[PDB]
Design a protein around this ligand. Structure first.
Ligand SMILES: [Mg+2]
Ligand SMILES: [Mg+2]
Length: 670
RNA sequence: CACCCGUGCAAAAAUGCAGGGGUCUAAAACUGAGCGGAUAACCUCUCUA
RNA sequence: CAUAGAGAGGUUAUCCGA
């Protein structure tokens, strides 16, 4: 947009006045004008970024000075929703939660629209921590190849946990057996950074107490991120100073290892939040660590800039005691950029190079009953980062069976540019681009011991791992969207409840929030109220104020059923859709995009689990089309995507392609 | 090529034109893709000792 | 099966890089 090119950073309504900010150093925002009614007021006299061409209640026109001269217009926030039609009034968020959010974080509602932006940034911090903690937990569950991991409480210490071995309660006995089945697993070496200690050039598995406290911290972070648990648990992440000493010690050693590797400040004074973030990073791919840490840096810097602007205006800003964490956001920003100066992808163990041999041999389906050939293949595979980011997220035999799904590899090869494909093909098999793609796909699907200087083998091996890496990473990044979606459902349910909406229990039925917002109710499990405009005009948020999307969300929700939506929720939140890729991707006639692939996986998982069960006739028709057409059904997607109705933009983005992926826009339907 | 909002001109309650949105979406700017040279460390054969 | 430079290749902190 040209407004940003003109340098108007933000527009802040305060009372009957609006303030306009400029782009300063980094994300610093310097105030420029205080436009009261229709009156000019210079607030900065040194290098003013822009000047006001004309001031009108409709909008303010500005011309850039620092950059290439460009004139733009900025709409008045005071009259955001008051137009043709109370003309001037501070706007509110689309979800109509602004007063509740302000009264949650601050002691009172505020007559401005600055605070809500800080709040939304904090709320985005929690979303990104939710996704990355669920990816960590999934990696660990994959390793086990699961209630134990999902139910980890910080309060419970190791001294209490070990008692469960002696205990007679069957669930507690299983809670301990699942722990003793995790010390080994012949896969714990994957996360050596957080599971092994250096103590002749050798390392050893850490003491059980520290492995437990690592796992406890990560499980608690994940569960707290997803469920937004009530009581004192809600403040947990913003009050880690109260952690048990054992978790402080564990965090201290884990974060201190890089420092002893490099000397940057020791863990003795870096905050527990930063150390917990680093611990979370230990389980992620490098791309995920970078996205996490940069989004944290961005949001904390925004928070700092808003707090500075509020302090310059003289607004009251002191957080309630339970959120006084954010008063330190300057230091947590400094610590996050310090971490970002040295964080690296989590190493494999140099000794486990001999333990991993069967996994490497499995991925390629290369197994029998000279040794040098297999050793060469294995060691050439194991060192590649496309292995480290694959066996941590998929079972090797499951990947090898998935690679037989010819249309999925054919699709992924259709995404690679013609030049890259030519290069690979001329390395791998020394005639048209699509015929070449087809043949390469066939080669990948029939990999065997025929590979046996004439060194062809590196070309074919590096191709295969790259195709499977791209496929699995895309499916994980699709899953992340619905994970964020359910996180938002479970948070906004509680926020609406605190605003006084009769939302009720969300775990009983995940569509309860969208129905509470729409004002419909269930009797005998059926929505007997037909569409009428008054229900849209009375809808509790701006998204559902429109007639046609109320009508559409109603018609889709009426043909949902509770069991399917709950099974979908748990399929997303445990990533079972990809964990059973072998059977879900079994029979796909044609793959159109990663969205169609992911929803085919989910719908085939549902069709497997509901094979012999109660099933509503709408679900039965969807499954019948999912069989008759060997591809995902769009209608079914809408049915199990209903709980996200409250946010129309989210709902639409997650239910038709072309709106799904920012990078692959395309035609929408109807 | 999504949503919401402002403003101007047709019109019968809607459409075309031009913009804005950290307070919409993973989504305020500040991108990404693929790749051509360094030092060292790094294991894997494959050579003989 | 020890331990003895050159050999051949993979991988890792950064531009000259569709
Ligand atoms: Mg929300
Ligand atoms: Mg989850």
């Amino acid at each position: 947009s040209m407004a940003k090119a003109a340098g108007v950073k933000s527009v802040f309504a305060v009372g009957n006045t609006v303030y306009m900010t400029s782009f300063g150093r980094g994300n610093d925002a310097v105030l420029e004008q205080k436009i009261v009614d229709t009156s000019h007021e210079p607030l900065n006299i040194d290098d003013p970024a822009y000047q006001l061409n004309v001031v009108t209640m409709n909008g303010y026109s500005v011309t850039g000075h620092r950059g290439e001269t460009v004139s733009a217009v900025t709409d008045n926030p005071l009259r955001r929703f008051n137009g043709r039609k109370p003309e001037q009034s501070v706007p509110t968020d689309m979800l109509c939660l602004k007063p509740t959010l302000e009264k949650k974080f601050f002691g009172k509602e505020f007559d401005d629209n600055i605070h809500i932006q800080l709040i939304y940034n904090i709320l985005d911090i929690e979303k990104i921590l939710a996704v990355y903690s669920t990816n960590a937990i999934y990696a660990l569950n994959n390793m086990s190849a699961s209630d134990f991991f999902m139910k980890r409480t910080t309060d419970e210490t190791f001294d209490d946990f070990e008692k469960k071995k002696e205990s007679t309660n069957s669930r507690e006995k299983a809670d301990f057996d699942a722990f003793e089945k995790f010390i080994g697993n012949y896969r714990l070496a994957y996360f050596a950074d957080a599971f092994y200690v250096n103590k002749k050039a050798k390392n050893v598995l850490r003491e059980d107490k520290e492995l437990y406290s690592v796992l406890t911290l990560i499980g608690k972070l994940r569960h707290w991120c997803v469920h937004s648990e009530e009581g004192r648990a809600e403040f947990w992440l913003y009050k880690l100073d109260e952690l048990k000493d054992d978790f402080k010690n564990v965090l201290d050693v884990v974060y201190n290892r890089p420092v002893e590797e490099i000397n940057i400040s020791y863990a003795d004074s870096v905050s527990e939040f930063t150390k917990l973030i680093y611990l979370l990073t230990r389980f992620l791919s490098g791309k995920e660590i970078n996205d996490l840490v940069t989004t944290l840096i961005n949001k904390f810097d925004n928070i700092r800039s808003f707090l500075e602007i509020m302090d310059e205006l003289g607004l009251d800003r002191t957080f309630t005691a339970e959120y006084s964490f954010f008063e330190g956001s300057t230091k947590y920003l400094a610590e996050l950029v310090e971490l970002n100066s040295f964080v690296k992808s989590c190493s494999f163990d140099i000794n486990a190079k001999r333990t991993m041999y069967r996994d490497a041999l499995d991925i390629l389906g290369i197994e029998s009953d000279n040794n040098g050939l297999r050793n060469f293949i294995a060691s050439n595979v194991i060192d590649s980062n496309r292995f480290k980011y694959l066996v941590r997220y998929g079972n090797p035999k499951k990947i090898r069976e998935t690679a037989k799904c010819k249309p999925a590899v054919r699709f992924v090869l259709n995404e690679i540019p013609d030049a890259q494909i030519e290069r690979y093909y001329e390395a791998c098999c020394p005639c048209s681009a699509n015929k070449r793609r087809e043949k390469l796909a066939d080669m990948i699907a029939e990999i065997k011991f025929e590979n046996f200087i004439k060194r062809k083998n590196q070309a074919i091996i590096r191709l295969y791992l790259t195709v499977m890496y791209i496929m699995l990473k895309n499916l994980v990044n699709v899953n992340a969207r619905y994970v964020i979606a359910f996180h938002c459902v479970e948070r906004d349910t509680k926020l609406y409840a605190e605003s006084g909406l009769e939302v009720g229990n969300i775990e009983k039925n995940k569509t309860n929030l969208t129905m509470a917002v729409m004002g419909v109710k269930l009797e005998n499990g059926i929505i007997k109220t037909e569409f009428d405009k008054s229900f849209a005009e009375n809808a509790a948020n701006r998204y559902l104020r429109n007639a046609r999307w109320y009508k559409l969300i109603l018609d889709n929700l009426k043909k949902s059923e509770r069991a399917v939506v709950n099974e979908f929720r748990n399929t997303v939140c445990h990533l079972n859709a990809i964990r059973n890729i072998n059977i879900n991707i079994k029979e796909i006639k044609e793959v159109e995009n990663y969205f169609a692939l992911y929803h085919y996986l989910i719908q085939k998982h549902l069709e497997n689990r509901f094979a012999d069960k109660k099933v509503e006739r709408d679900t039965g028709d969807f499954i019948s089309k999912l069989e008759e057409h060997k591809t995902y059904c769009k209608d079914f997607v809408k049915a199990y995507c209903t709980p996200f109705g409250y946010n129309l933009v989210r709902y639409k983005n997650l239910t038709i392609d072309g709106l799904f992926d920012k990078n692959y826009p395309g035609k929408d339907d109807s």
